[PDB]
């Protein structure tokens, strides 16, 4: 357990974090670094284009064997 219940203490700390608006709370320069790193892996996965943009297309001529 009855004492075990006193969840409360976790919430409060959830609360102060969530109540914070100025990026991700307690930055640390690493965040950007890691971010950028993963932002780079996705470039690898999805391609080197401007994903903000609609794509160009030049199509291949047909091929005969």
């Amino acid at each position: 357990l009855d004492p075990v219940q006193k969840f409360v203490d976790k919430i409060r700390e959830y609360r102060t974090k969530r109540q914070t608006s100025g990026g991700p709370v307690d930055a640390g320069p690493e965040y950007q670094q890691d971010l950028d790193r993963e932002l780079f892996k996705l470039k690898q996965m999805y391609g080197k284009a401007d994903m903000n943009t609609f794509p160009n297309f030049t199509f291949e001529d047909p091929k005969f064997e």
Binding site: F57, F59, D61
Partner: protein
């Protein structure tokens, strides 16, 4: 409005159908008719005629 931008752009983008710049066969055909067709057929007919003429005689 990226999505709106894209849905629009997607539709009413008309993808080109490839030019058929490849039917030179029609030509290579008509050519081999000069060749196969007429020339052979003409000679074959003439040969079949004489053969027939040759069976003519032999009937008598």
């Amino acid at each position: 409005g990226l999505v709106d931008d894209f849905e629009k752009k997607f539709n009413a983008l008309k993808v080109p159908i490839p030019e058929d710049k490849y039917t030179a066969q029609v030509d290579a055909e008509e050519k081999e008719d000069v060749k196969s067709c007429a020339e052979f057929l003409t000679q074959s007919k003439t040969r079949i005629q004489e053969y027939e003429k040759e069976l003519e005689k032999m009937r008598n």
